[PDB]
Amino acid sequence: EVQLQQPGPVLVKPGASVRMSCKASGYRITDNFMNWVKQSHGKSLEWIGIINPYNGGTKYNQKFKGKATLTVDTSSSTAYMELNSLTSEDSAVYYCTRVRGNDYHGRAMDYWGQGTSVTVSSASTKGPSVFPLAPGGTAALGCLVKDYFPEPVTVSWNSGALTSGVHTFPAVLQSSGLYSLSSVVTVPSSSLGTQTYICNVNHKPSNTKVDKKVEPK
Amino acid sequence: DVVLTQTPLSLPVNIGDQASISCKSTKSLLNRFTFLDWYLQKPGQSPQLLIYLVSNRFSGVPDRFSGSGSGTDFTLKISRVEAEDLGVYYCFQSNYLFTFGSGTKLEIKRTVAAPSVFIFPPSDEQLKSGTASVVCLLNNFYPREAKVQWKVDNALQSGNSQESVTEQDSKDSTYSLSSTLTLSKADYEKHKVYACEVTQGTTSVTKSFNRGE
Amino acid sequence: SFKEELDKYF
Structure with missing residues (x-):
């Protein structure tokens, strides 16, 4: 093709x-x-x-x-x-x-x-910091991806096995001149204790990947 | 440059309804053969060809999409609009210096859906770093217009939050929105109750948490 | 015209 x-x-x-x-x-x-x-x-x-x-x-x-x-x-x-x-x-x-x-x-x-x-841009590359966004039968969880440059970061969940209910938001440029975004997913509340949820954050401009297990607090 | 004026530039349609976009040109695009094309860009993809030579459907394109017109006036019609048809539609001429229209954003109008609202305290990991981000999530709602306000110990915040919104979902036609409040750790530990208030129409929903609880 | 320039060019 x-x-x-x-x-x-x-x-x-x-x-x-x-x-x-x-x-x-x-x-x-x-x-x-x-x-x-x-x-x-x-x-x-x-x-x-x-x-x-x-x-x-x-x-x-x-x-x-x-x-x-x-x-x-x-x-x-x-x-x-x-x-x-x-x-x-x-x-x-x-x-x-x-x-x-x-x-x-x-x-x-x-x-x-x-x-x-x-x-x-004249600004230097900077890899992201990744923080957990910790959790009617629907719970939300996610990952806050903060203070990176340049765009983009991509985010998947469970190495791409989890897709429905995922929202990865467009990045916002912060007053520091660094980008921030979050990715969230809605899951059954009853899955929190048994299913593992990992956000896979890739920032190719910095050759950085972050995998973060998001656990209930 | 020849200008391709599209009307409307914003095009809300029910699913199953007919959508029509006009593309008017300042100069006749007849070449003798009229070089007028229609392209679509769905959220997060490259543009793709729909119609070439005013009315010829490109391969793999459903026959709900139809093009017509002559000289300077042209029309793209979608007979029965589907959810997955959302995106920006462009006319494009190549009889003179190649130009595009400004693009028409096709949005799916649907029934009102209230958001499911979630608030997230800063993580302990972030707090050890000296900053605190509080995140409010509005999930799967319609219409997109909504006002999100932060209150800290019932004091309305201003200037310390940013929001971002998703493209319309190709399946359910809803939006989602995040608002993020940023404080220093030192300021975050001076207060107790953190709340995000979401107002749509005649209804406000406030979700909150108590710091250290 | 630039139209004719493209006709020749193509």
Whole structure:
């Protein structure tokens, strides 16, 4: 099957440059055009540019000429975007997409990568502190994940065996400039004494994983 | 740049009802072939293609989704809306400099559901670190509008709490919300009763705990 | 026009 494989989230310094990649699998990269798209705060979508991987020829949204440069390495079936002169306005999710082609295909974007979430910041990485949120037949428990940087942390419960009733909240940026979030799950009150509940917290920017058994107090 | 003005930008619909989004363009998208597409982004996923060439359904897309229009006026219709159809819908043109519409947030309107409310004291682990976070959880409620207030020994707090809210649940169409009160350990041990008050409509629910008990 | 530039480009 066709797949567009983009790296996970990256932290880069203001004023630096960053080159992000998109590896095409399941088709020949030169058979299709590629669009890059910027999404700010999960909301606004914005076309950056298009590249022909067989020619190398490019076309750019005016606002991004001089800012973004599209290139391809056909021998490794990988497309690249480099952003220069980075500022906090460049913190966004960058999508690489496959374009079906002209006319009958509609120039539509039929396959999308999962996106590279770029955080532009001068702040250092910091792993999270994880604290238990300890517990009509429905109990709530959870994990408070505090004082980490950059985003994201992901949270699972019982190594992914527990999914129903889980709510992992969007992080909030604290006045310290560090992020905090909580993940909670609702379970039968009567399960507290017999079932074990472990929150699995992964912070890849710091190469830290925390497993925390949440026990009744 | 050509502007794609979508209306409405916020679109509450009952399940089973018809949803219609208008996309109006400042310039005709006819190429001779009209390059107007519709994309959907569900919470936490990448955008995905729904309709290309104004009216052609992309592979694997149900026939409840339909596109129509010509020149500068275009419509996306969902005949019978399902819970899992929530997300942001975008029109997108590629006849000129590629542009997107602002996006239309499709929300599922449903019956009012009161939250189940839970309060969590700071953990002993955190207190040994010199800080105390108190967390109030509002689980599976509708509609999303709600006011959460912290009271400490019946004194209303301000400026020391933050909240965050989930996306609408694709199964039950509810929201959940957390509010977190942050104090120093030194301040936390100066008071007894910690309470979060949740008000929706004509009803307030207060959950509380007594410190050291 | 930029429309024609894309037609040629495609």
